[PDB]
Design a protein around this ligand. Structure first.
Ligand SMILES: C=CC1=C(C)/C(=C/c2[nH]c(/C=C3N=C(/C=C4\NC(=O)C(C)=C4C=C)C(C)=C\3CCC(=O)O)c(CCC(=O)O)c2C)NC1=O
Ligand SMILES: CCCCC/C=C\C/C=C\CCCCCCCC(=O)O
Ligand SMILES: CCCCC/C=C\C/C=C\CCCCCCCC(=O)O
Ligand SMILES: *[C@@H]1O[C@H](CO)[C@@H](O)[C@H](O)[C@H]1NC(C)=O
Ligand SMILES: *[C@@H]1O[C@H](CO)[C@@H](O)[C@H](O)[C@H]1NC(C)=O
Ligand SMILES: *[C@@H]1O[C@H](CO)[C@@H](O)[C@H](O)[C@H]1NC(C)=O
Ligand SMILES: *[C@@H]1O[C@H](CO)[C@@H](O)[C@H](O)[C@H]1NC(C)=O
Ligand SMILES: *[C@@H]1O[C@H](CO)[C@@H](O)[C@H](O)[C@H]1NC(C)=O
Ligand SMILES: *[C@@H]1O[C@H](CO)[C@@H](O)[C@H](O)[C@H]1NC(C)=O
Ligand SMILES: *[C@@H]1O[C@H](CO)[C@@H](O)[C@H](O)[C@H]1NC(C)=O
Ligand SMILES: *[C@@H]1O[C@H](CO)[C@@H](O)[C@H](O)[C@H]1NC(C)=O
Ligand SMILES: *[C@@H]1O[C@H](CO)[C@@H](O)[C@H](O)[C@H]1NC(C)=O
Ligand SMILES: *[C@@H]1O[C@H](CO)[C@@H](O)[C@H](O)[C@H]1NC(C)=O
Ligand SMILES: *[C@@H]1O[C@H](CO)[C@@H](O)[C@H](O)[C@H]1NC(C)=O
Ligand SMILES: *[C@@H]1O[C@H](CO)[C@@H](O)[C@H](O)[C@H]1NC(C)=O
Ligand SMILES: *[C@@H]1O[C@H](CO)[C@@H](O)[C@H](O)[C@H]1NC(C)=O
Ligand SMILES: *[C@@H]1O[C@H](CO)[C@@H](O)[C@H](O)[C@H]1NC(C)=O
Ligand SMILES: *[C@@H]1O[C@H](CO)[C@@H](O)[C@H](O)[C@H]1NC(C)=O
Ligand SMILES: *[C@@H]1O[C@H](CO)[C@@H](O)[C@H](O)[C@H]1NC(C)=O
Lengths: 666, 295, 98, 30, 87, 98, 49, 49, 49
């Protein structure tokens, strides 16, 4: 049934030897004391359903007669997708990734598959309750990693507690969609399944380079403190840990409601494109731009985007979309780019240095080129200055180098436009190309051209992940009282944090707040005394606590959980604050009290009596004071560039800083 | 380390005596009026009349040390500075000694001075009538005690008049407690500067991590996030360095206050101009926000 | 010294064995600036600690002058009570007065 | 003829809502 | 032209691509119009609780405005302040 | 890059490609090379998809002689006389660690 | 003020005369951060003195 | 190491383990009079007997 | 050989003196402090290489 994974299933994170160190790492791990599911052979019932594979599993088999023999991993698990079988057939270990018809009841005494075809991967090994066999399976970048460990046990029912480190044995290059799996049994045994999570661990190495202990940094605040200070031992006192956090629960996607597919056919498939000197601009608005309908018919020789990775173009929404169209020759397509020179970039069409958009170009030799010669396309090659970005020049005026007007049938007077001569039989550098330039803005203005992402219902007063017109984040959404003007979409703080948004479906204003808030302190005795701690939460009245535990009560400093309140007052060794102190007193426990200011005393004033000492004592008191500390010196060259000549040459121009440091230390 | 030192400073200044003397019922000791510097059992407060004025002169920022989450989400239209600090990871911890505890310490010191004199610092308190203690203080500065014993009415009246003038000076708005206001102003300004410095992009595309992760691509985003990381780490380091230097200045001031309490409240000093202008006779301590006032 | 400060690696040998000279010269400067910052932080903390130690040593010198070489009238400056004598003893990095 | 522009002709620099702040900007202004 | 303060709002962003160096007004066949020129300048603007611009400081008008833009406040206390060097 | 072969963002290796018009292109037309153009999601890096199942935009199974049901693989048509953007290229990707 | 802090040059005129605007804006920020660090170090030493 | 310095290697021809150590070690001080007096100096080496 | 030098210029822009930073520890100290004159005392130079 349901069991717990008590410090179970740690593996080696890399292939690097380390000894006598503490190593902090973040990876896919089985969290400490997490739920695991058990599968037992109660009777003739064969317990082997299809268990889902959620980014890696921990598998344990408690055995005495070798019942579990292997696994099948796949997605559809019928005949339509690739699957991989990893089994031991009592003579070899065989791994086989193919496309085979599975059985509803796969077992040994070899009945696993009806038939197989389209085989991709093959591996054959060499020929050859009391046992516990542990495995970690994870899928990443087309690789299946397998980690293995072994332990002799004696238990009869449950998964035994303990700590055991697993070692890598297999890294299989399969490239398979793995979402489901199933175990293979023989025709008295049990097996346990747990799930991996992305987690930060801290591992301890021996002097032999073996992992023997670990700390899960997200288990409880004491472990957070241990991972923060990078030590396994904590001294007695009170420590300010990280602030109180909650994890997001739901997802909100809000996009404008648009129906029309965006006019790819009208732009990319037009009978007539202008010359480059008379390029044309068209506004794009109120459309859905998914561009996956172009994968059937239209292909581009060049496609280059500036200001955004192409792979995110389906997750965004675009504000002010314009499309520029013209025709050039093949050798001029390289000129349509920021910071370029040449006849096109100087006299015909120039892009800004801080351009944001995309450039698309494709060959059009079968439309704009004739055998006789198409002479309908022109470009300007004479001008008295360079163009500014997105500026057009249309005039056809005779050109003179000196700068005065002239008549074209004369000397030093030219016509400023040349013809492109497009033939069928020429080389590809003289063939026509159609060019479209798209320009837009991102995430600062109202937008009406978005991607094909689907919207989601609104959630109020709860920590969620949100996506408004491509702006993603995590927070709490509340109704707002701000009054946006019609040209505004977002609102910002004094620290440039986006704190207000207008919902693009219903035009209401929403406030965005962070999810984490409130300071947390951990009160502990020494680690030798106990592993019990007390937790003090400021900013809560006793809720927003990690656990309710036992003995929760309110102090002047905050809400204290895990300590017992005593009426008597003493001196204190752990100062909590606001007059409250804590100690470790008797079965021992943690007690909290009000600190004592001193001893009560009374002397009575009289106007006619005096008190005189009659005897005396000689006392000797000690007083200790520091006088000096250790004198130290550093050598910059060895600290920064240890025995490297290239690094020393690069460091050679930082010498004033090091002579300043040496002067301070001396 | 800075916070622990802040608790140690108050402990070393105010907690010098070991036993807590009770306030006498009679406040009138041979002509001298101690009612304005001692607590009375009729008012709701636990402190003297002058300490009330001293706490009224200085404005604070944190009334309590408790700002709940529902309160900050109830106040969004009012852009409160404390909510902005707390949503960005900056918190202020309560002092260990409550103001009532410090008031009790000063009351014990004043009662011990008015009843026992100078002997409760060397050891156990010795009772003595106040006129004889005044005679010894007069004898300590080179004036014979018949001068006290023959002019006791005039000296008592001048003492009461001076106390009334101190009371009248602190009721009018002024800048007498102006170097206690500078401490809280500096702390608030440092925290608000940390909050406002978070909008610098440090030579990156934007100062918002969400904008970089929504638009840029993973290897290109990982080189823009490190600029913001280094800039914000530098801001935190600068704040910590300034705080350490300010803590050193406060520690020197607290050491001077501790030795002044030891050598001027618990005894009579021969050092010129170390406690007031003139020949020193007595001193009384009063608690103040983040500080001490000696009369 | 194991922080990469936003570079490929924290090891100069790995960057110089694999990356190419102009690309390696922009990854080495990140490590240089990070390690220079670490040294500067260490020196600043050391200067502040030295100021605290100097104040303590000045107090110890005036206490040795006014309590071992003479008798002091200052209240609670040397022990609790009426001061008669004082004796100094050496200690690791410090002094103990009796 | 000749007159003076006494604090005349300020416009909104962007399309972002801001309230109760002081904003420092550099642009083409009268 | 009357004195005062008034904030203008965007109404048009026209994609023309035209060399603009000259202009002329069009009248009807009793009125006046005024022309001024823009310069690259740093301003400091104040927002209300309603998100409206109601005051501004021109940082290059006089040394007091330079001080105001340096400290980012509309109010300066009594004293002496070291401003930027003479340029 | 979406439906056939995707590289990781932190890729380490080399890409080599060369023109093979004299081997994989005939005058009649070589139709033995295929690519997928319909899928319900993008591929992960170094992931392969082999199945040939009829595709429906709504997501339910269908019979190919019907409406809104397609075959997800297209043929490359490689001729000798076409332009160089329609000529076959052989691609080898090498991946390693250092 | 003659350290280039890992940039092309320590002279802003050389970078602006030769490099191109987006490429120059990433070389100017290195000099800005280096000189800001120098001023901060000077101010810290002055406070301690 | 703990400072990510490669300190051990396995020889790829004979499978033995080797330790790698730096070559520079030990502090050096130079004692000099004024440069006007002489160009002679004395050198003190710590960490050598 | 590849070497670090320190050169001195006149008021006429002429090189008239130089220091070879790898000759002896005194020259290492001179190149470290960037001066041709060293005062009397003891100075911690670079570690032994
Ligand atoms: C399922 C795939 C499978 C894998 C990947 C596997 C790996 C594996 N099996 C081993 C031994 C061994 N493995 C088993 C039996 C099993 N061990 C199991 O994980 C299972 C399910 C069985 C049941 C058949 C036995 C009996 C030995 C030999 C133990 C011995 O030498 O004393 C070893 C240690 C080799 C050594 O002795 O040096 C490894 C790494 N065995 C497998 O069967
Ligand atoms: C015609 C109107 C288009 C308006 C779209 C506006 C913004 C969307 C941004 C980029 C869309 C890219 C479309 C072409 C993608 C080609 C993909 C390829 O095969 O390489
Ligand atoms: C033949 C002697 C040339 C000497 C010029 C020396 C330095 C000038 C630097 C670059 C000049 C580039 C010339 C070619 C420009 C081609 C522009 C284009 O169409 O893309
Ligand atoms: C683990 O199982 C317990 C039941 O014993 C359940 O209460 C708990 O919610 C489970 N853990 C999670 C993360 O759901
Ligand atoms: C294959 O993987 C994709 C994501 O890469 C997933 O959406 C799909 O559901 C998987 N296939 C099956 C049959 O589950
Ligand atoms: C795959 O398996 C199914 C099982 O019903 C079968 O109908 C189908 O013919 C198989 N396909 C092939 C190619 O063998
Ligand atoms: C186990 O599988 C291998 C793989 O082909 C085969 O050679 C071997 O004979 C099998 N063993 C048995 C007992 O069938
Ligand atoms: C998979 O098998 C089918 C026959 O069942 C075959 O037509 C097809 O080409 C195979 N696919 C691959 C990629 O080999
Ligand atoms: C390290 O290895 C040696 C040799 O096997 C062994 O004796 C020693 O116990 C090991 N260390 C630990 C902590 O187990
Ligand atoms: C792709 O184009 C072919 C040929 O014109 C057509 O038969 C097919 O239906 C198209 N596919 C889609 C999804 O429109
Ligand atoms: C472009 O349009 C023409 C006529 O409208 C049509 O014949 C041609 O097939 C279209 N091309 C594409 C790729 O849709
Ligand atoms: C579509 O958007 C309009 C404009 O905001 C909105 O009024 C309408 O409610 C939306 N449609 C639905 C079904 O919500
Ligand atoms: C906590 O709540 C109780 C009642 O809900 C209230 O009486 C008490 O004053 C609150 N504590 C604080 C510090 O406000
Ligand atoms: C008190 O004094 C007497 C004589 O002066 C002496 O014998 C006695 O020991 C003293 N008391 C104590 C406790 O020493
Ligand atoms: C002075 O003492 C008298 C008692 O005789 C008291 O009534 C009076 O209030 C005291 N003065 C002040 C200022 O409180
Ligand atoms: C803000 O708007 C409200 C509602 O119109 C108005 O009453 C108030 O006067 C405005 N604030 C200012 C400063 O004008
Ligand atoms: C070649 O390598 C093997 C494997 O380490 C080694 O045993 C052998 O000595 C090497 N050959 C020589 C000539 O050293
Ligand atoms: C130096 O070596 C000599 C003999 O080799 C030895 O007697 C002496 O103790 C050594 N010095 C130190 C400091 O160990
Ligand atoms: C510099 O040049 C002038 C003019 O020739 C000369 O007189 C002077 O001696 C030169 N300086 C030195 C140091 O030689």
């Amino acid at each position: 049934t349901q069991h717990t994974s008590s410090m179970r299933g740690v593996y080696y994170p890399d292939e690097i030897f380390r000894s006598d160190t503490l190593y902090l790492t973040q990876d896919l791990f089985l969290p400490f004391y997490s739920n695991v599911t058990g599968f037992h052979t109660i009777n003739h019932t064969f317990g082997n359903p299809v268990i889902p594979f959620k980014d890696g599993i921990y598998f344990a088999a408690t055995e005495k007669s070798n019942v579990v023999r292997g696994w099948v991993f796949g997605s559809t698990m019928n005949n339509k997708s690739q699957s991989v079988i990893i089994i031991n057939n009592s003579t070899n270990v065989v791994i086989r990734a193919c496309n085979f018809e599975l059985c509803d009841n796969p077992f040994f005494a070899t009945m696993i598959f009806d038939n197989a075809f389209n085989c991709t991967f093959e591996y054959i090994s060499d020929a050859f309750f009391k046992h516990l066999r542990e495995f970690v399976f994870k899928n990443k970048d087309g690789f299946l990693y397998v980690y293995k460990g072994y332990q002799p046990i004696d238990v009869v029912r449950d998964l035994p507690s303990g700590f055991n480190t697993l070692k890598p044995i297999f890294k299989l290059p399969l490239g398979i969609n793995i979402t489901n799996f199933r175990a293979i049994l023989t025709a008295a045994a049990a097996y346990f399944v747990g799930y991996l999570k992305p987690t930060t661990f801290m591992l301890k190495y021996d002097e032999n380079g073996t992992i023997t202990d670990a700390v899960d940094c997200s288990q409880n605040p004491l472990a957070e403190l241990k991972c923060s200070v990078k030590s396994f031992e904590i001294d007695k006192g009170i420590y300010q840990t990280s602030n109180f956090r909650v994890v997001p629960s739901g997802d909100v996607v809000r996009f404008p409601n648009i129906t029309n597919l965006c006019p790819f056919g009208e732009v990319f498939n037009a009978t007539k494109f202008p010359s480059v000197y008379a390029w044309e601009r068209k506004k794009i608005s109120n459309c859905v731009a998914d561009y996956s309908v172009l994968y059937n018919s239209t292909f581009f020789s060049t496609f280059k985007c500036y200001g955004v990775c192409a792979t995110k173009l389906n997750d965004l929404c675009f504000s002010n979309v314009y499309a520029d169209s013209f025709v050039v020759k093949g050798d001029d397509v390289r000129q349509i780019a920021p910071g370029q020179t040449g006849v096109i970039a100087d006299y015909n069409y120039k892009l800004p240095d801080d351009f944001m958009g995309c450039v698309l170009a494709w060959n059009t030799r079968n439309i704009d080129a004739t055998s006789t010669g198409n002479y309908n396309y022109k470009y300007r090659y004479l001008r008295h200055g360079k163009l500014r970005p997105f500026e057009r020049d249309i005039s056809n005026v005779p050109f003179s180098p000196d700068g005065k007007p002239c008549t074209p049938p004369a000397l030093n007077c030219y016509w400023p436009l040349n013809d492109y001569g497009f033939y069928t039989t020429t080389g590809i550098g003289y063939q026509p190309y159609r060019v479209v330039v798209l320009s837009f803005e991102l995430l600062n203005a109202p937008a009406t051209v978005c991607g094909p992402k689907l919207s989601t219902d609104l959630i109020k007063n709860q920590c969620v992940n949100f996506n408004f017109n491509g702006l993603t984040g995590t927070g709490v959404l509340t109704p707002s009282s701000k009054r946006f003007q019609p040209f505004q979409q977002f609102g910002r703080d004094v620290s440039d944090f986006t704190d207000s948004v207008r919902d693009p479906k219903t035009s209401e204003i929403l406030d965005i707040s962070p999810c984490s808030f409130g300071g947390v302190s951990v009160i502990t005795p020494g680690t030798n005394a106990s592993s019990e701690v007390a937790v003090l939460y400021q900013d809560v009245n006793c809720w927003r606590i990690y656990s309710t535990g036992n003995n929760v009560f309110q102090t002047q400093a905050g809400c204290l959980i895990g300590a017992e309140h005593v009426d008597t007052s003493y001196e204190c060794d752990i100062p909590i604050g606001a007059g409250i102190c804590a100690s470790y007193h008797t079965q021992k426990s943690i007690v909290a009290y009000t600190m004592s200011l001193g001893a009560d005393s009374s002397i009575a004033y009289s106007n006619n009596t005096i008190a005189i000492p009659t005897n005396f004592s000689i006392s000797i008191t000690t007083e200790v004071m520091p006088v000096s500390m250790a004198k130290t010196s550093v050598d910059c060259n060895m600290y920064i560039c240890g025995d490297s000549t290239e690094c020393a040459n690069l460091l050679l121009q930082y010498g004033s800083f090091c002579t300043q440091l040496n002067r301070a230390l001396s | 380390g800075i916070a622990a030192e802040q608790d140690r400073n108050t402990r070393e200044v105010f907690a010098q005596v070991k036993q807590m003397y009770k306030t006498p019922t009679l406040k009138y000791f041979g002509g001298f009026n101690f009612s304005q510097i001692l607590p009375d059992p009729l008012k709701p407060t636990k402190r003297s009349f002058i300490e009330d004025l001293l706490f009224n002169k200085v404005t604070l920022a944190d009334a309590g040390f408790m700002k709940q989450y529902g309160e900050c989400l109830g106040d969004i239209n009012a852009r409160d500075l404390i909510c902005a600090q707390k949503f960005n990871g900056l918190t202020v911890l309560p002092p260990l000694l409550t103001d009532d505890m410090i008031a009790a310490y000063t009351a014990a010191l004043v009662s011990g001075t008015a009843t026992a004199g100078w002997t409760f610092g060397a050891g156990a308190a010795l009772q003595i009538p106040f006129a004889m203690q005044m005679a010894y203080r007069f004898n300590g500065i080179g004036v014979t005690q018949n001068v006290l014993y023959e002019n006791q009415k005039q000296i008592a009246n001048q003492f009461n008049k001076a106390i009334s003038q101190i009371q009248e000076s602190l009721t009018t708005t002024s800048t007498a407690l102006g170097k206690l206001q500078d401490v809280v102003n500096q702390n608030a300004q440092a925290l608000n500067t940390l909050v406002k410095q978070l909008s610098s992009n440090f030579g990156a595309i934007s100062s918002v991590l969400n904008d970089i992760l929504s638009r840029l691509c993973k290897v290109e985003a990982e080189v823009q996030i490190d600029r913001l990381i280094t800039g914000r780490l530098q801001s935190l380091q600068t704040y910590v360095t300034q705080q350490l230097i300010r803590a050193a200045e406060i520690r020197a001031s607290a050491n001077l206050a501790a030795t002044k309490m030891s050598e001027c409240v618990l005894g009579q000093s021969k050092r010129v101009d170390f406690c007031g202008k003139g020949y020193h006779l007595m001193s009384f301590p009063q608690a103040a926000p983040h500080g001490v006032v000696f009369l």
